[PDB]
């Protein structure tokens, strides 16, 4: 495997970290949330085709193994279709109104509701939470700083 | 390739396993050869120095149970730095539990704060901000007495 | 391609918090394990008199 | 056990207040504990009980204890213990609401399923000599010091 | 005010159930339907900047508070008079004073029912919007009693 | 009770006829008149406008 | 992927190559072993009372260089503790110093926040009191047209 072996082992830890999983192993549905937490940031999409494009009852009836799992990583890592944030800065532009920096953030929740491979209304408020200011605008430039960030 | 590369990891931990094994063996196989060579050689040596080796094994044996004192002191600063360590590792975690609070806090203050302040403030923000409105419906109802 | 630097800003997020959280809970229990056998030691109660 | 020095292991105040009980529970201070005098603390503690059953644990340490065995018997069941202040920060990390009461169902699933995974009748062991309210509510903020058995 | 911890607000809860207590204290049902709105309602619902709902108010219009005195043929009166005759137990009959339905002469049509509807049941809703509304017990027997 | 914004539902009496009328049918009829009026003024003036 | 099956059935070649190898020291060594305790037995017939001696010599030898090792992994691991400590206890000062600029540091922050709320209230107040006199000169404008 073209992998160094020192981040190998703090890849192994953090997997390892689980652990309520019956034993050294991981379910369909929650190896996303393990292939995001260690790094990279793949896309549904992404992640139902690494998997084999598995079935919708497939995601909790099964179980894998870290073998499994390091390969599905290295492959996030060496092929991916993201993107720089240069172009991201320059895509929430588009709701910009006055063009002042700033955007609703009704706004950019309903586009990242509806718009995209949607997301539930748990995890939109938490992300843009901490961002609240008196106009109820929030700056799609440092959203995507500290998204960058994380 | 994914799949056929879980193999090669098999198959290099048991490269690697088995490669341990070697230079185990190597080591166990090549102390045989001096531990045989000292047997033959033991046999024909002189005699004497068997005892006089004998005088410094005494003397050997002390620094393997001194070197227990040392084992035990190496331990001690092991497990002290490792058993302080945990207070340590604890005193940030405890640190943090109250920097997520403290951070809050800072929020709740300023939350609290403005229950007050803001709510004085909105206070001329309501009868006051009224007038705009009737400021405008003035303007609206003085064009009535104007037209 | 933005919404998934936001789906693992959340599960980086949640993860680091479960592990803090991980950690918390071993002083919990390590502090509940001993405990155990020293509740019911005849010179503790005694001696917190 | 790991044996290094004793004076290490507690902390200033705590090898203080360790030093300062061993210098009051003696009826004849002179550096050895003997069974007549924990009989006696016991009749005076708790209004002249006899458990003659406490003399068996004496063979646990050579002979008499003594100051030194004292503080070594208790350091060796009081290790993996920290104080309340930690203790009390450590709790603050669930709930984050902080209400001072966590649910009895809640604790009982925390404690087995991260970590070491306690059994069930070990959570329950915890309950079996403390007081409850009948909607749960783990009083944590109270427990804290009914931990250290500071009460009774 | 939906979020991580979402859960049934007070205002949400608040906002449905007072829609159906002024129904029961106004609507009256009428020859051309069983549910008739007796009154214009104009229910002002704020927002805040990020769209959360945090406030209502509701302005009534011309009452028709002629229809408790005297009705027509085949038409009923406010349906809050026959929940309370209905829905009134043993204790609160001889609380209020109540009477039949024959004794009141205001009830010109007396007692008619609407098809698919049980006033002992409306009168117990109400009551149950009433208290989760936030209307204390006292405000409630005052009520009744005025009624 | 502080709003941006705020919509405003409005329910007023419709359309009431019956084989005797008071003042109340005659305000009914008046306020839906009205309303008829304003939507299809807010339709068809305000647009020409 | 076939690159990867080939490097996965290439590495099999090592690992068979390495259990070969490997099986040569193990018979090897069970031939040495056999050998040796006919030396060993052999020595101790010759001349046990005085070869006695020179067999814990070796082994003495052996477990010399054993304590060597042990205080030289010992050492590796308690400086390595030792230095481990210290990035935990320079993260808790350097914490400590986040203890002060964050939560501590938020002080003169959240004070900012709340102080600029007392300069925004009295602004807005001014905003709003400015404004209201505005409406006393449309009111006066409405007055004055109804003179
Ligand atoms: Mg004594
Ligand atoms: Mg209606």
Redesign the pocket.
């Given at each position: 495997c073209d992998f160094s072996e020192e981040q190998t082992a703090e890849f192994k830890e953090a997997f390892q970290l689980f652990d309520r999983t019956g034993d050294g192993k991981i379910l369909y549905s929650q190896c996303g949330d393990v292939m995001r937490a260690l790094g990279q940031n793949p896309t549904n999409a992404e992640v139902m085709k690494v998997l084999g494009n598995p079935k919708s009852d497939e995601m909790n009836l099964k179980t894998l193994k870290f073998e499994q799992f390091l390969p599905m990583m290295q492959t996030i890592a060496k092929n991916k279709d993201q993107g720089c944030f240069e172009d991201y800065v320059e895509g929430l532009r588009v709701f910009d109104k006055e063009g002042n920096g700033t955007v609703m953030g009704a706004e950019i929740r309903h586009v990242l509701v509806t718009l995209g491979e949607k997301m539930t209304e748990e995890e939109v408020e938490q992300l843009v939470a901490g961002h609240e200011d008196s106009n109820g605008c929030i700056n799609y430039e440092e959203l995507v700083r500290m998204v960058l960030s994380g | 390739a994914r799949e056929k590369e879980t193999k090669a990891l098999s198959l290099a931990r048991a490269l690697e396993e088995a490669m341990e094994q070697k230079a185990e063996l190597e080591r166990l196989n090549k102390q045989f050869r001096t531990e045989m060579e000292d047997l033959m050689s033991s046999k024909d040596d002189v005699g004497k120095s068997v005892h006089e080796l004998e005088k410094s094994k005494r003397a050997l044996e002390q620094q393997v149970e001194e070197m227990k004192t040392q084992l035990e002191e190496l331990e001690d600063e092991l497990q002290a730095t490792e058993d302080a360590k945990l207070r340590l590792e604890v005193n940030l975690q405890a640190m943090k539990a109250q920097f997520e609070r403290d951070l809050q806090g800072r929020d709740e203050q300023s939350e609290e704060k403005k229950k007050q302040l803001v709510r004085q403030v909105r206070e001329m923000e309501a009868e006051l901000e009224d007038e705009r409105k009737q400021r405008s419906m003035a303007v609206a109802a003085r064009k009535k007495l104007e037209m | 391609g933005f919404q998934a630097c936001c789906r693992g800003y959340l599960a980086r997020k949640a993860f680091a918090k479960r592990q803090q959280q991980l950690t918390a809970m071993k002083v919990l229990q390590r502090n509940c394990a001993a405990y155990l056998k020293l509740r019911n030691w005849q010179w503790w109660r005694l001696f917190t008199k | 056990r790991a044996t290094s020095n004793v004076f290490a292991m507690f902390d200033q105040s705590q090898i203080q207040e360790f030093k300062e009980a061993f210098n009051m529970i003696?009826?004849?201070?002179?550096?050895?504990?003997?069974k007549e005098?924990l009989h006696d603390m016991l009749a005076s503690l708790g209004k002249n009980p006899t458990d003659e059953y406490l003399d068996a644990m004496m063979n646990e340490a050579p002979g008499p204890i003594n100051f030194t065995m004292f503080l070594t018997m208790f350091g060796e069941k009081l290790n993996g213990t920290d104080p309340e202040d930690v203790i009390r920060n450590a709790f603050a990390c669930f709930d984050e609401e902080a209400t001072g009461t966590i649910q009895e169902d809640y604790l009982r699933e925390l404690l087995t399923t991260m970590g070491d995974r306690f059994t069930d009748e070990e959570v329950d062991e915890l309950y079996r000599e403390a007081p409850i309210d009948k909607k749960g509510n783990f009083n944590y903020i109270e427990f804290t010091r009914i931990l250290k058995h500071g009460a009774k | 005010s939906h979020k991580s911890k979402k859960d049934q607000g007070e205002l949400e809860r608040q906002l449905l159930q007072a829609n159906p207590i002024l129904e029961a204290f106004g609507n009256a049902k009428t020859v051309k339907n069983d549910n008739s709105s007796r009154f214009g309602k104009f229910i002002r619902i704020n927002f805040d900047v990020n769209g959360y709902i945090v406030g209502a108010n509701i302005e009534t219009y011309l009452l028709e508070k002629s229809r408790a005195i005297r009705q027509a043929k085949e038409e009923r009166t406010f349906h809050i008079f026959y929940y309370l005759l209905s829905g009134a137990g043993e204790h609160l009959k001889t609380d209020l004073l109540l009477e039949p339905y024959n004794k009141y002469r205001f009830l010109s049509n007396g007692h008619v029912t609407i098809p698919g509807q049980q006033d002992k049941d409306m009168f117990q809703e109400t009551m149950e919007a009433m208290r989760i509304m936030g209307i204390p017990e006292e405000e409630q027997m005052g009520l009744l009693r005025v009624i | 009770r502080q709003g941006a914004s705020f919509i405003g539902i409005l329910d007023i009496a419709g359309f009431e006829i019956f084989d005797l009328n008071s003042f109340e049918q005659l305000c009914i009829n008046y306020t839906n008149e009205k309303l008829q009026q304003l939507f299809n003024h807010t339709m068809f003036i305000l647009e020409q406008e």
């Open positions: - | - | - | 003696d009826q004849n201070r002179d550096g050895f504990i003997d005098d | - | -």
